[PDB]
Design an enzyme around this catalytic site. Structure first.
Site, mmCIF file in Angstrom:
data_model
loop_
_atom_site.group_PDB
_atom_site.id
_atom_site.type_symbol
_atom_site.label_atom_id
_atom_site.label_comp_id
_atom_site.label_asym_id
_atom_site.label_seq_id
_atom_site.Cartn_x
_atom_site.Cartn_y
_atom_site.Cartn_z
ATOM 1 N N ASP A 69 43.187 -9.364 -12.500
ATOM 2 C CA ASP A 69 43.241 -7.959 -12.647
ATOM 3 C C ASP A 69 42.926 -7.301 -11.311
ATOM 4 O OD1 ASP A 69 43.745 -5.565 -13.960
ATOM 5 O OD2 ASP A 69 41.625 -5.188 -14.538
ATOM 6 N N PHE A 86 35.915 -2.799 -21.890
ATOM 7 C CA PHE A 86 34.872 -3.767 -22.134
ATOM 8 C C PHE A 86 33.505 -3.323 -22.570
ATOM 9 C CE2 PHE A 86 32.946 -0.907 -18.608
ATOM 10 C CZ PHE A 86 33.883 -0.469 -18.104
ATOM 11 N N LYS A 119 26.412 -3.022 -15.881
ATOM 12 C CA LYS A 119 27.608 -3.116 -16.768
ATOM 13 C C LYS A 119 27.296 -3.474 -18.199
ATOM 14 C CE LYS A 119 31.970 -5.499 -17.019
ATOM 15 N NZ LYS A 119 32.921 -6.177 -16.491
ATOM 16 N N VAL A 137 29.619 1.362 -18.055
ATOM 17 C CA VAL A 137 28.749 0.865 -17.035
ATOM 18 C C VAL A 137 27.904 2.360 -16.649
ATOM 19 C CG1 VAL A 137 29.020 0.669 -14.555
ATOM 20 C CG2 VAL A 137 30.764 -0.024 -15.870
ATOM 21 N N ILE A 170 28.625 6.146 -15.736
ATOM 22 C CA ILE A 170 29.691 6.135 -14.521
ATOM 23 C C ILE A 170 31.031 5.315 -14.938
ATOM 24 C CG2 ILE A 170 27.919 6.521 -12.623
ATOM 25 C CD1 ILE A 170 28.505 3.701 -11.737
ATOM 26 N N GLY A 171 31.100 5.265 -16.229
ATOM 27 C CA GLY A 171 32.300 4.228 -16.523
ATOM 28 C C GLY A 171 32.362 4.089 -18.006
ATOM 29 N N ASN A 172 33.483 4.120 -18.521
ATOM 30 C CA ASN A 172 33.516 3.709 -19.927
ATOM 31 C C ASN A 172 35.083 2.982 -20.193
ATOM 32 O OD1 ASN A 172 32.372 3.758 -22.372
ATOM 33 N ND2 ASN A 172 31.866 5.884 -22.627
ATOM 34 N N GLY A 173 35.064 2.020 -21.045
ATOM 35 C CA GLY A 173 36.375 1.255 -21.001
ATOM 36 C C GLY A 173 36.223 0.307 -22.117
HETATM 37 O O1 LIG Z 1 31.182 -3.647 -11.520
HETATM 38 C C1 LIG Z 1 31.360 -1.999 -11.407
HETATM 39 N N1 LIG Z 1 32.148 -1.461 -12.401
HETATM 40 C C2 LIG Z 1 33.262 -1.775 -13.293
HETATM 41 C C3 LIG Z 1 32.894 -3.362 -13.851
HETATM 42 N N2 LIG Z 1 33.949 -3.717 -14.605
HETATM 43 C C4 LIG Z 1 35.233 -2.976 -15.102
HETATM 44 C C5 LIG Z 1 35.397 -1.607 -14.448
HETATM 45 C C6 LIG Z 1 34.389 -1.179 -13.428
HETATM 46 C C7 LIG Z 1 34.533 0.058 -12.941
HETATM 47 C C8 LIG Z 1 34.252 1.346 -13.696
HETATM 48 C C9 LIG Z 1 34.395 2.318 -13.023
HETATM 49 C C10 LIG Z 1 35.019 2.658 -11.708
HETATM 50 C C11 LIG Z 1 35.235 1.294 -11.092
HETATM 51 C C12 LIG Z 1 34.926 0.146 -11.438
HETATM 52 C C13 LIG Z 1 30.925 -1.495 -10.390
HETATM 53 C C14 LIG Z 1 29.915 -2.068 -9.523
HETATM 54 C C15 LIG Z 1 29.251 -1.605 -8.577
HETATM 55 N N3 LIG Z 1 29.677 -0.264 -8.131
HETATM 56 C C16 LIG Z 1 30.627 0.478 -8.958
HETATM 57 N N4 LIG Z 1 30.685 1.764 -8.207
HETATM 58 C C17 LIG Z 1 31.463 2.565 -8.720
HETATM 59 O O2 LIG Z 1 32.183 2.677 -9.826
HETATM 60 C C18 LIG Z 1 32.130 3.760 -7.871
HETATM 61 C C19 LIG Z 1 31.423 5.362 -8.196
HETATM 62 C C20 LIG Z 1 32.924 4.784 -8.222
HETATM 63 C C21 LIG Z 1 31.250 -0.127 -9.991
#
Ligand SMILES: O=C(Nc1cnccc1-c1ccccc1)c1ccnc(NC(=O)C2CC2)c1
EC number: 2.7.11.26
Length: 345
Positions: free
Chosen positions: A146, A32, A50, A35, A27-30
């Protein structure tokens, strides 16, 4: 299918437990790392995992900061553990967090692309809770560095906001220098753009101010892909900073000599003047003239939140708003008289 790892609870004594989870997806790439989201087997609870490369030399700073944090408006570290996977024989730190389904970014974008504004009661609820999380972390001397819409998690049913991503967070000691290249696009304080190394924890407050304006305007208040553009946009609102004002941020260029735009004229006609007033007291050149997080919580713009009769548009009650602890009020203990209203249990 089911993944079982031995994870250390975030809060509490270092006594690791077997933890199992399924339905893992990305659900996330970056910069860092990556995720994931997965479901805990023993609870059904959704989590965010993460995954970051672990610096062989030192302890991970984010983990050590997050292990010290306990507040209803900061995302919770449920577990953490170590794994393999890619790089080259390297160790990965996995931070296991409570999953929150939304962010101010996604929600703000829904409203802007639908051409409405986010209802002010949500602006009050969300901004108040952001200021609380800051009051808290700042009381430890920890600056987030940030603060931006993507790092403000939301549960749209409960109206709970949670601050996340402490990857850039650091404790700021007087006389210790710090990198100026922290903070993102539209949310950098002028003293960062000017490259100050002696900045204080009020940079977070500048950023928070940018989020507030944006929620009101429907777009960022100070856009630009370079510092120069951002600075020009800033001067167009705040006017040209004075010699004293420049000194309070930095050395060492003259600027557009443009006078101030009347803050009432920077927002839509229906905008509440309490909100315009709170903006103007956060978005100040002189980083010491800005409100503290706690002082902003106590701002009149949030009075409605302290009304005994207030409810969410969905009918539900408001979430925890007043469980201030002595730590959280330490900046200014007498504000408790304003912050904790008579009906709050
Ligand atoms: O710690 C988190 N992300 C991150 C931690 N470090 C850096 C960036 C993120 C991040 C990644 C994607 C979206 C938002 C935050 C994190 C923790 C709990 N819930 C979410 N939920 C979501 O992302 C919602 C579906 C949208 C993100």
């Amino acid at each position: 299918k089911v993944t079982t790892v031995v994870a250390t609870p975030g809060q509490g004594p270092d006594r690791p437990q077997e933890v199992s989870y399924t339905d893992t997806k990305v659900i996330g790439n970056g910069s860092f790392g990556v995720v994931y989201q997965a479901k805990l087997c023993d609870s059904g609870e959704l989590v965010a995992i993460k995954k970051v490369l672990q610096d062989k030399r030192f302890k991970n700073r984010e983990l050590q900061i997050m292990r010290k944090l306990d507040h209803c408006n900061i995302v919770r570290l449920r577990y953490f553990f170590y794994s393999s996977g890619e790089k080259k024989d390297e160790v990965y730190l996995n931070l296991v967090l409570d999953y929150v389904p939304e962010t101010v970014y996604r929600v703000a974008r829904h409203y802007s692309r639908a051409k409405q504004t986010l209802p002010v009661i949500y602006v009050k609820l969300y901004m108040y809770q952001l200021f609380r999380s800051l009051a808290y972390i700042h009381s430890f001397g920890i600056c987030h560095r940030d603060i931006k819409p993507q790092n403000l998690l939301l549960d749209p049913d409960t109206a709970v906001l949670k601050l996340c991503d402490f990857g850039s967070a650091k404790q700021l000691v007087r006389g210790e220098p710090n990198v100026s290249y922290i903070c993102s696009r539209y949310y950098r304080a002028p003293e960062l753009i000017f490259g100050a190394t002696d900045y204080t924890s009020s940079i977070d407050v500048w950023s928070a101010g940018c989020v507030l304006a944006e929620l009101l305007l429907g777009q960022p208040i100070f856009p630009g892909d370079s510092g120069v553009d951002q600075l020009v946009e800033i001067i167009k609102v705040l006017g040209t900073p004075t010699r004293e004002q420049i000194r309070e941020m930095n050395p060492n260029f003259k600027f557009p000599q443009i006078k101030a735009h009347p803050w009432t004229k920077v927002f839509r006609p229906r905008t509440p003047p309490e909100a315009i007033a709170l903006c103007s007291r956060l978005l100040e050149y002189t980083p010491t003239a800005r409100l503290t997080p706690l002082e902003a919580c106590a701002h009149s713009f949030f009075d409605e939140l302290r009304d005994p009769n207030v409810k969410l548009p969905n009918g539900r009650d408001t979430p925890a708003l007043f469980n201030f602890t002595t730590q959280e009020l330490s900046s200014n203990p007498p504000l408790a008289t304003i912050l904790i209203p008579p009906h709050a249990r």
